[PDB]
Every structure is written in structure tokens, then in C-alpha cells.
Curated annotation (Swiss-Prot):
Region described as G2 motif: spans on this chain: 143-151
Region G4 motif, annotated ranges: 235-242
Any Gene Ontology biological process: phototransduction, visible light
GO cellular component, one term: photoreceptor disc membrane
Name of the protein in question: Guanine nucleotide-binding protein G(t) subunit alpha-1
Domain G-alpha stretches: 2-323
Functional summary from the UniProt entry: Functions as a signal transducer for the rod photoreceptor RHO. Required for normal RHO-mediated light perception by the retina. Guanine nucleotide-binding proteins (G proteins) function as transducers downstream of G protein-coupled receptors (GPCRs), such as the photoreceptor RHO. The alpha chain contains the guanine nucleotide binding site and alternates between an active, GTP-bound state and an inactive, GDP-bound state. Activated RHO promotes GDP release and GTP binding. Signaling is mediated via downstream effector proteins, such as cGMP-phosphodiesterase.
Residues noted as binding GTP in the record, renumbered to the chain: 10-17, 120, 145-151, 173, 239-242, 296
Organism: Bos taurus
Effect of residue 17 to N: Facilitated GDP-GTP exchange, increasing the levels of the activated GTP-bound form
Amino acid sequence: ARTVKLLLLGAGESGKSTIVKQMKIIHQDGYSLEECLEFIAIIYGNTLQSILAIVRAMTTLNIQYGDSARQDDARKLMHMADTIEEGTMPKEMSDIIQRLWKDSGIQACFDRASEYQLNDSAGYYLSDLERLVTPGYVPTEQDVLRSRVKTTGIIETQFSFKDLNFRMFDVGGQRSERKKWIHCFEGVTCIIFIAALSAYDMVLVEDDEVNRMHESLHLFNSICNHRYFATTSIVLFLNKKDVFSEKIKKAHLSICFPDYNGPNTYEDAGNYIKVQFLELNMRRDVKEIYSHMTCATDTQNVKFVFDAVTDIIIKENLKDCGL
Ligand SMILES: Nc1nc2c(ncn2[C@@H]2O[C@H](COP(=O)(O)OP(=O)(O)OP(O)(O)=S)[C@@H](O)[C@H]2O)c(=O)[nH]1
Ligand SMILES: [Mg+2]
């Protein structure tokens, strides 16, 4: 059996750990009931942190509530957040959150997410708070998949697929978590580099003066043209195609790429983004980098993109297991 050392790289929140959860579902035993119950505290914490961030932005963005009474809910919320048991969601809390989300000022702020820092799954959980809070709540896979926890260490996933024994490694992509990346570059059969399509109008959590996609582009440049990776198969997942789809129709790609020309559309601007990343490949002549529009939260999609990825691994047979 061939051993494939695979590295998931990309900037913060690009979707690397969600691809890991997918491998568990698609290629391992999937989630047990008890594991699912472990995500409730995460889901509840994510719901709380996402609403607090929209409330908080009400001020910084100078946005009034569609009903000044919601201001009462906001404070109370802020107070409960420092008093509730971490990861919990009492009825008193979700009632307040349910009213705030139903407020049009809040909805105006939510829509201006790009202007501040808000979880990807904010709308996903808030819009469905009622269910998440229905007594007897045990998460679904999409709920678990929508989950968010910044990766601070290194995580390995091993599974057998098409007779290759994968050794997949997950790591945080935020600036401070990149420092350790170097110790992992030894003997890499393949890298799936992940970039969020929807990050073209966002700013870094690390430096609000740095666009997320330029950073991603720089990192890609450093990884793509890296010594160790001479052989190494490199694939680009242009991720969060679903969000890019909704986003493209409203925000100008020019905000990221001042020189960008065409119809601010999905097929067209998505391709432009593919090029800006692939142009970076100083070895485009000799190498050819396989990219694809992906939705990491979409099981069947990841299942089909990975099967193609691994068919590459199998094809362009090369280097494997490091050390
Ligand atoms: N809508 C949507 N949400 C996604 C997609 N991929 C990931 N997410 C959501 O984005 C959040 C961030 O992704 P996550 O997998 O945690 O990123 P990461 O790149 O591993 O993050 P880090 O550890 O480097 S900070 C999660 O809440 C996750 O469910 C996607 O294709 N579409
Ligand atoms: Mg992660």
C-alpha cells in the first residue's frame, strides 16, 4: 500500500478543517451520536459569538435598530454572555437573540458582514436558531460541518482510499499558526491549498488593513514556489463557491482587484480569481495545477473533488511519506 502524506494549507478560515470533517464522513466511520453531542457547546458558542459581533457592529457601523426596544435586548444579551455557562443557550438568551435577528437594523448590519469580523455560519445558525434550541436538540452533520473552531495545533487524519493509505494533516492558517508549518514540509506527496472565493472583499482578522484574498494570494505564492515542493502535487480548492455565488452579485470584484475588468459574475469573476492564483505558479510550463470551485460544507461535492484529487495522486505518481 502506497502512503500518501497530504497537507491542507491555506489562510485562516479558508475551510481546511471542514475538509477534514468531510473525510471522517466520507472515508472513515462518520460521526457517532456522542461526537455529535460534543458539537452542541461549539454550535451554541458560535451562535452567541456571531450575534454579539452583529450587535457590536451596530455601533461601529452607526446603525440603528428598526425598533429602539431591541437596544434593551442588546444590553441584556451582552450581560448574559458574561454570566451564562460557556457554550450554553438558555431560553432567555435565544429569545432575545431571536428578536434581534428579526430586527431590520440587525439585518442591515448582518448584510454589512464584510465590514467587520463575523463567522461564516452566522446566518446559517441565527436564521435557524429555533431548531437549534428545540428541546432534545442533537446536531445534524451539516450543523457539525458548519461548526467553527480555530485550529491551534496540528491534526492528522488517516484513511485508506483507492488502495492509497492517506496521512492527511490539518493546521491553523492564521498568521501565528504558520510559524510551525516548516516542520511539516518533509516528504509531501500532495498539497491541497485552500482559498475562499468569498474573501475578496474581506479583511484579515490579524490586520484589518489587509484584504483576505491578497494575503491568501501571497501565501499561495510562497507555498506554490517552495523548494521542498519541487515534486509535490499541488491542488487549489477555490472554496465557498456557494457564498461567492450570493456575494458576487453584490460586491465588486474590483474592490480586491482594482484592475479587474469584466462582468462581476460567477463564471467570469471566478475564473479571474483562478488565474490570479495560477499565474503565481512560476513553474507553469512544467507543472500544471489542478484547481476547482468547491463548497467544503457540501459532502457530495468534497466526495467528488477528492476522488478527482486522488486520481491525480495516482496518475502523476511521485514522492510520498516524509521524514
Ligand atoms: N458556506 C460555507 N461555509 C464554509 C465553507 N467551508 C467552510 N465553511 C465554514 O467556515 C468556517 C471556517 O472554516 P474552517 O474549516 O474552520 O477553516 P480553516 O481554514 O480550517 O481555519 P483555521 O484553522 O485555518 S483558522 C466554519 O464555520 C465552516 O463551517 C464553504 O464552502 N461554504
Ligand atoms: Mg481549521
